[PDB]
Design a protein around this ligand. Structure first.
Ligand SMILES: Nc1nc2c(ncn2[C@@H]2O[C@H](COP(=O)(O)OP(=O)(O)CP(=O)(O)O)[C@@H](O)[C@H]2O)c(=O)[nH]1
Ligand SMILES: CC[C@H](C)[C@H](N)C(=O)O
Ligand SMILES: [Mg+2]
Ligand SMILES: [Mg+2]
Ligand SMILES: [Mg+2]
Ligand SMILES: [Mg+2]
Ligand SMILES: [Mg+2]
Ligand SMILES: [Mg+2]
Ligand SMILES: [Mg+2]
Ligand SMILES: [Mg+2]
Ligand SMILES: [Mg+2]
Ligand SMILES: [Mg+2]
Ligand SMILES: [Mg+2]
Ligand SMILES: [Mg+2]
Ligand SMILES: [Mg+2]
Ligand SMILES: [Mg+2]
Ligand SMILES: [Mg+2]
Ligand SMILES: [Mg+2]
Ligand SMILES: [Mg+2]
Ligand SMILES: [Mg+2]
Ligand SMILES: [Mg+2]
Ligand SMILES: [Mg+2]
Ligand SMILES: [Mg+2]
Ligand SMILES: [Mg+2]
Ligand SMILES: [Mg+2]
Ligand SMILES: [Mg+2]
Ligand SMILES: [Mg+2]
Ligand SMILES: [Mg+2]
Ligand SMILES: [Mg+2]
Ligand SMILES: [Mg+2]
Ligand SMILES: [Mg+2]
Ligand SMILES: [Mg+2]
Ligand SMILES: [Mg+2]
Ligand SMILES: [Mg+2]
Ligand SMILES: [Mg+2]
Ligand SMILES: [Mg+2]
Ligand SMILES: [Mg+2]
Ligand SMILES: [Mg+2]
Ligand SMILES: [Mg+2]
Ligand SMILES: [Mg+2]
Ligand SMILES: [Mg+2]
Ligand SMILES: [Mg+2]
Ligand SMILES: [Mg+2]
Ligand SMILES: [Mg+2]
Ligand SMILES: [Mg+2]
Ligand SMILES: [Mg+2]
Ligand SMILES: [Mg+2]
Ligand SMILES: [Mg+2]
Ligand SMILES: [Mg+2]
Ligand SMILES: [Mg+2]
Ligand SMILES: [Mg+2]
Ligand SMILES: [Mg+2]
Ligand SMILES: [Mg+2]
Ligand SMILES: [Mg+2]
Ligand SMILES: [Mg+2]
Ligand SMILES: [Mg+2]
Ligand SMILES: [Mg+2]
Ligand SMILES: [Mg+2]
Ligand SMILES: [Mg+2]
Ligand SMILES: [Mg+2]
Ligand SMILES: [Mg+2]
Ligand SMILES: [Mg+2]
Ligand SMILES: [Mg+2]
Ligand SMILES: [Mg+2]
Ligand SMILES: [Mg+2]
Ligand SMILES: [Mg+2]
Ligand SMILES: [Mg+2]
Ligand SMILES: [Mg+2]
Ligand SMILES: [Mg+2]
Ligand SMILES: [Mg+2]
Ligand SMILES: [Mg+2]
Ligand SMILES: [Mg+2]
Ligand SMILES: [Mg+2]
Ligand SMILES: [Mg+2]
Ligand SMILES: [Mg+2]
Ligand SMILES: [Mg+2]
Ligand SMILES: [Mg+2]
Ligand SMILES: [Mg+2]
Ligand SMILES: [Mg+2]
Ligand SMILES: [Mg+2]
Ligand SMILES: [Mg+2]
Ligand SMILES: [Mg+2]
Ligand SMILES: [Mg+2]
Ligand SMILES: [Mg+2]
Ligand SMILES: [Mg+2]
Ligand SMILES: [Mg+2]
Ligand SMILES: [Mg+2]
Ligand SMILES: [Mg+2]
Ligand SMILES: [Mg+2]
Ligand SMILES: [Mg+2]
Ligand SMILES: [Mg+2]
Ligand SMILES: [Mg+2]
Ligand SMILES: [Mg+2]
Ligand SMILES: [Mg+2]
Ligand SMILES: [Mg+2]
Lengths: 86, 392, 205
RNA sequence: GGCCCCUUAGCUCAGUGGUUAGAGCAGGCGACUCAUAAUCGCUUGGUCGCUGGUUCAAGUCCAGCAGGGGCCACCA
RNA sequence: AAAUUGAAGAGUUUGAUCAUGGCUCAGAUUGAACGCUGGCGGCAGGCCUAACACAUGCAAGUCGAACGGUAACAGGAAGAAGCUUGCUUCUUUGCUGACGAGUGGCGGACGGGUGAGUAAUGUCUGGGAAACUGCCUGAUGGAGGGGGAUAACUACUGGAAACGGUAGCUAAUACCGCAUAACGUCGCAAGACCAAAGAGGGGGACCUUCGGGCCUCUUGCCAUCGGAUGUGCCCAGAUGGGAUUAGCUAGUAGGUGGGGUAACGGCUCACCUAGGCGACGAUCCCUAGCUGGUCUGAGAGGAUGACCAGCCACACUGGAACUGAGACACGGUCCAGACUCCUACGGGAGGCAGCAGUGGGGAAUAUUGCACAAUGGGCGCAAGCCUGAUGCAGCCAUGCCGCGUGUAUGAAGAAGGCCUUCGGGUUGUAAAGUACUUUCAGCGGGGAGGAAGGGAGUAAAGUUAAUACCUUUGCUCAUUGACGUUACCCGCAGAAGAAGCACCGGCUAACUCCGUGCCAGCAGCCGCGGUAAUACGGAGGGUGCAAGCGUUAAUCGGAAUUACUGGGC
């Protein structure tokens, strides 16, 4: 740049992306683990995966990386999917 | 960004004149290099001067080149002139503004027609002080012929009212001095010493409305149109309003910026070669031959009467009388314009040695007032000179 | 913004003295009124509708001394008001300052009044007004400044205008030279040699 | 600032320095008509762009300008 | 009471007439341009063409009362030049005020520029439901305890530079768990699950490892339901020309399921159904930002979108996304391309449609100015810093408005021009003469308003254990103006410094001589000139405007000559 005030901002922006990517990856990994658990047909495994997936998405939504409605959609879709099968 | 100028040492103008290819660009480069070597910071180069393609392709000079140096007596501005016989107007422009002249004569070639022409036009413009510097003494060093060359150049100078038997002569070669040997640059020091001693300080009359003849026009990118010239008499300051009067119709503008050798000057006193930036002027409008003066100082004229003396015989010029319809080129200040002349009842013939009264009309008007010195020249021959008698 | 030439030529063209001189003498011994100016004065060719309209408009303009732009603005303003346009135009041009100064005897002619107004010598309601066309409203006191009361021209013209008719709406004391309005004027108080409907026709084309 | 080009009657044009620079289409005069066109009877016309030089001798050989046209530079 | 008072024709087809029908004229206006001329001020306006290319300098920062520290500056002691034994001279302290670079917070998405793209992904009017929202505000609550890191810095070192790398050390309102939890999320239910940050002022009652503990006050920090502002989404109607453009569409029209977004939705995929738009003009090609409004007209209409206000689109050209409450971001990031620069040849840097300025294009459009004094804006507790927004100044008869270039009396009806009937008439009271006034400009002298506030002192009342810090109100005391030599007033000498342009056959206001001779020329339309020209050229006289006057370009009117109001075969 050329104004010595946006360079600082670029620095925080790249640091923030580098910090956010790991959290997004971890959250996606846990959710897709849940999806695979439904896929296999193992209701106990899917239920357990949901049980320790709930805290992750809720804490991330509180941190703000996602939105309350996003976590609610994930939680509700997974609950309906799991409770359908038995 | 720019560096200002420190008004501490006196300013004066010098120039070089002589026959073609007697080392005039080389001498200027050698003198500036030596002077910066002993004390200073100029140290000019050769090819940096001649920038035009024809300059480097043909090994000649087409115009006048500006340089600067100083000694712990004064500060000198130098002008480099051509030597050919069809670039005369540039040499006249160079000689008009220069207070001091140095004439270059080579012992190999001796005096040549162009040297005589340069001396004659210097006399007809009125250069007060000329110093002669012999050139190419590296290849000839015989005492028994340099005396003959010195006698010849003294005769040439003395023939036309210059002091010849008291003016000094310096012998040396510029090429060795520019090379940088251990002994051939002392001749440069002697030339500079004789330059300072032989040029007494002239008057600095800055007590009348500002006037500036125009000699060259430039376009500085980003900034605009710039005129160049040496201030004759007066003083100008940034923000003042001046007026352009000359061949074309009169206009006005303001001096919004001054410079000198790309070094800023707060206020230009009379007698300095400076460049002035003018607001809101397209390049083709302002041309050399015009005048830039303070408002209410001079006005244009077309017809006026003067006293003209055709050059007497055995001095050059011509050999025949003139009559009605004669259209010679008047050279006034810096401008050459061909106009018509008229002689009174009787004295129809023109004799070489009789000064007569004429009335001259010029096609392009010029900023003229009573008491101006103008020369006469046409057809590659200068015929006479005179001064203004009456403005009509 | 004024006229700076001969004065009697205007009346000679209009065929009537337009009060442009003081009145020390009579008009008949200053100019040949019945002879129009120039090399062509004897002949009297016949006019048209445009001719009569233009001649009347020029007559009124030369009487009061108002150039064309102000007159056109006056016409627009008079048509802008409520009522007849001719009466409105007469009221508007009768209510400007230099006309009132002339009608109150302080000046020999309209030009004398104009010099007095424009040289800052009149107080209206105590304050200095400098402008010739300053519009004046009822109940305005007009007076001269105390520095100018020693002039000879004003005293000469004070006891020279009583031969003319006394205006019925400019109550004046000539001793302390103090004047006042009461209300607007009317056609009953104005001369009978103007046909304003010609002007209304001319600007309605 | 430098180099190369064009200048003949109103339009279009010829004119290889030995003595007044010619052609065509034009044009004026005398008759006839209110005035012409046509038919007649005579036909005048020139700074060779200007100025100055060399030749015994020049628009024509030589130089400087006038104006226009085609390129090349230069950057307080 | 008022917000209405409004409607004009002429010239030209023929030997003459009536009718039809085109051409021309009289009015109003403009971001204007050219020619001649040019005294002053007030309020406005000023690249319409190359969204062509840009030299130089400014246009976005602030917080120490979040933090680690001391690069610069100002506050002490001892050594220590001489003694008037500290007169004077020099070196050693982050304890304090302040603060360069660094972590952290907020802003940088506002304000400013341009109209290229866009005929409906936009705008205008009227409605709606499936959403989010920093700062501002109300209510009810929480505010417990731990942990691992890194910049600056220290040592080494790469590199032309930009910019790096290696090994240790350190602070938080930087980051990550834990502790509890709801009116909150999911769930029929039962249940399962998620947060926090500390700073600053003063000190009485009570103790120190003398760090502070301890009381109160101001401000923050986190969760839920509201108010306001703002933004995203949907529907109906209105929004230029061409049929010498008639058919267009396969994610295309609908349905089920999965996914995705702050939110509904073919937004996206797998499969099913075979539909959907179109003479009420789809599709296709050309031109174009839209509105409140502006000019014109008696209205109905016609032309249009310069200045100001609302909305939209763009930021050298083509793409894409991160960060954030808000962007796919004018003075940010990544890649590609065309131009311009630095380079040690390995590699680097740049984007005026921000303010001035330059070249070029054009009939044609301005200074590389002053200041934060006032109004708004960012940051901060405040003081205060920044602001080419803004308030002013400069250049331009570009527009509207105002004023002056003197006022009287004066026949000898003078010289001088011009005409003549030779008698005389005219320019003309015009001049010259005599008597008065000083607007504006010239010089000098005095001198409002835009200024609210901020600072200091003092007192009363508030909350607390407290006369303490802090807050409110009063009062008191010296200062804040670029414009600026403001506006305005007074004095001086003197009519003293200040008038041009078009027209004169008819339409249309205003007439005669000389020159020329269908030649030279004029012309908005009829038309003038062939040897006695009110029409060409000059002069005298006259008419119309006036610091302007004319010509060219463009729009409505007249034109009932696109006829809805209001025409014909
Ligand atoms: N040995 C020697 N050589 C010389 C001398 N002077 C000039 N020269 C040589 O002559 C060459 C050309 O001379 P130059 O300097 O161009 O002459 P000039 O007079 O300046 C050319 P102009 O007249 O156009 O300005 C140069 O390259 C230089 O080397 C001298 O004194 N001695
Ligand atoms: C002598 C002229 C010089 C170049 C000057 N300093 C410029 O111009
Ligand atoms: Mg991965
Ligand atoms: Mg040279
Ligand atoms: Mg008058
Ligand atoms: Mg008047
Ligand atoms: Mg009205
Ligand atoms: Mg009307
Ligand atoms: Mg009309
Ligand atoms: Mg009619
Ligand atoms: Mg008419
Ligand atoms: Mg006809
Ligand atoms: Mg006829
Ligand atoms: Mg008709
Ligand atoms: Mg009308
Ligand atoms: Mg002009
Ligand atoms: Mg013109
Ligand atoms: Mg002009
Ligand atoms: Mg431009
Ligand atoms: Mg533009
Ligand atoms: Mg435009
Ligand atoms: Mg550009
Ligand atoms: Mg800069
Ligand atoms: Mg601190
Ligand atoms: Mg403090
Ligand atoms: Mg602290
Ligand atoms: Mg803070
Ligand atoms: Mg300091
Ligand atoms: Mg500290
Ligand atoms: Mg401290
Ligand atoms: Mg401070
Ligand atoms: Mg700081
Ligand atoms: Mg903001
Ligand atoms: Mg705009
Ligand atoms: Mg717009
Ligand atoms: Mg509409
Ligand atoms: Mg810890
Ligand atoms: Mg190094
Ligand atoms: Mg900690
Ligand atoms: Mg951690
Ligand atoms: Mg927890
Ligand atoms: Mg903590
Ligand atoms: Mg608190
Ligand atoms: Mg907004
Ligand atoms: Mg409508
Ligand atoms: Mg429209
Ligand atoms: Mg679904
Ligand atoms: Mg989002
Ligand atoms: Mg939709
Ligand atoms: Mg467009
Ligand atoms: Mg537009
Ligand atoms: Mg519309
Ligand atoms: Mg309308
Ligand atoms: Mg109307
Ligand atoms: Mg109508
Ligand atoms: Mg109207
Ligand atoms: Mg009506
Ligand atoms: Mg009306
Ligand atoms: Mg528009
Ligand atoms: Mg615009
Ligand atoms: Mg606007
Ligand atoms: Mg504005
Ligand atoms: Mg831009
Ligand atoms: Mg882009
Ligand atoms: Mg580009
Ligand atoms: Mg985000
Ligand atoms: Mg920019
Ligand atoms: Mg600009
Ligand atoms: Mg320009
Ligand atoms: Mg141009
Ligand atoms: Mg112009
Ligand atoms: Mg400035
Ligand atoms: Mg500005
Ligand atoms: Mg003008
Ligand atoms: Mg003005
Ligand atoms: Mg006016
Ligand atoms: Mg007389
Ligand atoms: Mg006479
Ligand atoms: Mg005040
Ligand atoms: Mg006319
Ligand atoms: Mg006319
Ligand atoms: Mg008319
Ligand atoms: Mg007319
Ligand atoms: Mg008439
Ligand atoms: Mg004429
Ligand atoms: Mg005609
Ligand atoms: Mg005649
Ligand atoms: Mg005539
Ligand atoms: Mg005007
Ligand atoms: Mg027109
Ligand atoms: Mg028109
Ligand atoms: Mg109509
Ligand atoms: Mg008609
Ligand atoms: Mg009909
Ligand atoms: Mg029929």
């Amino acid at each position: 740049a050329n104004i010595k005030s946006a360079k600082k901002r670029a620095i925080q922006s790249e640091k923030a992306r580098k910090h956010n990517a790991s959290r997004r990856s971890m959250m996606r990994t846990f959710i897709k683990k849940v999806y695979a658990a439904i896929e296999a047909g193992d209701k106990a495994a899917a239920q357990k995966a949901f049980n320790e997936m709930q805290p992750i998405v809720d804490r991330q939504a509180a941190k703000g990386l996602i939105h309350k409605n996003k976590a609610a959609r994930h939680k509700a879709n997974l609950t309906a999917q799991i409770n359908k099968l038995a | 960004s720019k560096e200002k100028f420190e008004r501490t040492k006196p300013h004066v103008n010098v120039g070089t004149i002589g026959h073609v290819d007697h080392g005039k660009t080389t001498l200027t480069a050698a003198i500036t290099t030596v002077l910066a070597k002993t004390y200073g910071g100029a140290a000019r180069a050769f090819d940096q001067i001649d920038n035009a393609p024809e300059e480097k392709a043909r090994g000649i000079t087409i115009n006048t080149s500006h340089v600067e140096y100083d000694t712990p007596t004064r500060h000198y501005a130098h002008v480099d002139c051509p030597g050919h016989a069809d670039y005369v107007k540039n040499m006249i422009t160079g000689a008009a503004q220069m207070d001091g002249a140095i004439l270059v004569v080579a012992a190999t070639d001796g005096p040549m027609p162009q040297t005589r022409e340069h001396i004659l036009l210097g006399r007809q413009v009125g250069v007060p002080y000329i110093i002669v510097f012999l050139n190419k003494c590296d290849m000839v060093d015989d005492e028994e012929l340099l005396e003959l060359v010195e006698m010849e150049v003294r005769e040439l100078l003395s023939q036309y009212d210059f002091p010849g038997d008291d003016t000094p002569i310096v012998r040396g070669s510029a090429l060795k001095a520019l090379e940088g040997d251990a002994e051939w640059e002392a001749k440069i020091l002697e030339l500079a010493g004789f330059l300072d001693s032989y040029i007494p300080e002239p008057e600095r009359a800055i007590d009348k409305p500002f006037l500036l003849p125009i000699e060259d026009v430039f376009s500085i990118s980003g900034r605009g149109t710039v005129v160049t010239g040496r201030v004759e008499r007066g003083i100008i300051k940034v923000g003042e309003e001046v007026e352009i009067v000359g061949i074309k119709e009169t206009q006005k503008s303001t001096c919004t910026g001054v410079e000198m050798f790309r070094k800023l000057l707060d206020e230009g006193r009379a007698g300095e070669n400076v460049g002035v930036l003018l607001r809101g002027i397209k390049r083709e409008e302002i041309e050399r031959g015009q005048v830039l003066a303070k408002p209410g100082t001079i006005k244009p004229h077309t017809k006026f009467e003067s006293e003209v003396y055709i050059l007497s015989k055995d001095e050059g010029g011509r050999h025949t009388p003139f009559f009605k319809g004669y259209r010679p080129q008047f050279y006034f200040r810096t401008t050459d314009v061909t106009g018509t002349i008229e002689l009174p009842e009787g004295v129809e013939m023109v004799m070489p040695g009789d000064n007569i009264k004429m009335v001259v009309t010029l096609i392009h008007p010029i900023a003229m007032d009573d008491g101006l010195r103008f020369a006469i020249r046409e057809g590659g021959r200068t015929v006479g000179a005179g001064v203004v008698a009456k403005v009509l | 913004a004024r006229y700076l030439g001969p004065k009697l030529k205007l009346s000679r063209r209009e065929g009537t003295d337009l009060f442009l001189k003081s009145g020390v003498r009579a008009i008949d011994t200053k100019c040949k009124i019945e002879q129009a100016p120039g090399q062509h004065g004897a002949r009297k060719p016949r006019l048209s509708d445009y001719g009569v309209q233009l001649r009347e408009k020029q007559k009124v303009r030369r009487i009061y001394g108002v150039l064309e732009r102000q007159f056109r603005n006056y016409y627009k303003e008079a048509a802008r008001l409520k009522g007849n346009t001719g009466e409105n135009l007469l009221a508007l041009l009768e209510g400007r300052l230099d006309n009132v100064v002339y009608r109150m005897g302080f000046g020999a002619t309209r030009a004398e009044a104009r010099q007095l107004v424009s040289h800052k010598a009149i107080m209206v309601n105590g304050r200095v007004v400098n402008i010739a066309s300053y519009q004046v409203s009822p109940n305005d006191v007009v007076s001269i400044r105390e520095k100018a009361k020693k002039q000879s021209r004003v005293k000469a013209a004070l006891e020279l205008a009583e031969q003319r008719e006394k205006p019925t709406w400019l109550e004046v004391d000539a001793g302390k030279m103090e004047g006042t309005f009461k209300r607007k004027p009317e056609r009953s108080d104005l001369s009978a040699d103007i046909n304003e409907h010609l002007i209304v026709e001319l600007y309605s084309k």
